[PDB]
Point group: C3
């Protein structure tokens, strides 16, 4: 009955990204200091986790989206979302 | 099962673990010298958290969800306040 | 139903650890720059969260595994996983 979220942040402003799994879809809300807005990330999933790291000022985000026993990694490296190499044998 | 979320900062470290249990989220805290129950108390069934340092000051954001509504709670050095977060 | 995951990362390679809870078993997949591999972590739980911090170049990881209302902390401090003092 309740949605499931994952959050990450970086720098001191900060920037924040909050991912929500709702009815099989994961969407993203974003803060960069002046208001929340809807982000580009939109992929299937019933469960989400996230981690991120900086290289200098460049953010790198990895979102782990799961449906059933299948987890797909999605990558942001400054220039759009792409599927990552992660696999598991769940 | 209960649902948890964890964050940490520095090198001591400090850790905060948030647990959703039967619609209530509570907080356990480590600052190097034993666990204790923190001030955070808010309703929710699922929880996530992030935190960042500004120099030596910690800032924490906890995202508490009930049904389709997620409420953000903010620690900025003196109590927890409702944040600007909204979602559709 | 779906598996439930938690993730942490460190440094600039980076290293990543992803924990998956699946029918009461939590396992770990690891990235250190050249491929994913299955890590040493194997503990029971229906829910998992994680946090980590560097002390110099040394990674320290805390995984919070829950079954019912009992959360167990598992600690990586450089040479295997040990149970932690976290209580709630
Ligand atoms: C600039 O794009 C915004 O920030 C990136 C870091 C991602 O979170 C993306 O989905 C979002 O729309
Ligand atoms: C370069 O490879 C990409 O980034 C790494 C840090 C990992 O997240 C990997 O699975 C992904 O495909
Ligand atoms: C000093 O207060 C303790 O630490 C803060 C950073 C918060 O986690 C608060 O809820 C907790 O009671
Ligand atoms: C200053 O605004 C507060 O802190 C920001 C970093 C965000 O968490 C925002 O939603 C919150 O209301
Ligand atoms: C070197 O060992 C690998 O990395 C450690 C940091 C842990 O994640 C461990 O479970 C994993 O097998
Ligand atoms: C040294 O103590 C160990 O590490 C601390 C950072 C905590 O995670 C504690 O519960 C654990 O037993």
């Amino acid at each position: 009955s309740s949605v499931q979220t994952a959050a990450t942040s970086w720098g001191t402003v900060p920037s924040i990204r909050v991912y929500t799994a709702n009815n099989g879809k994961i969407t993203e809300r974003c803060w960069d200091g002046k208001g929340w807005y809807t982000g580009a990330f939109n992929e299937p999933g019933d469960n989400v986790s996230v981690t991120s790291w900086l290289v200098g000022s460049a953010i790198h985000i990895r979102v782990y989206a799961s449906t059933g026993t299948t987890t797909t990694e999605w990558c942001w490296d400054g220039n759009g979302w792409t599927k990552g190499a992660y696999t598991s044998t769940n």
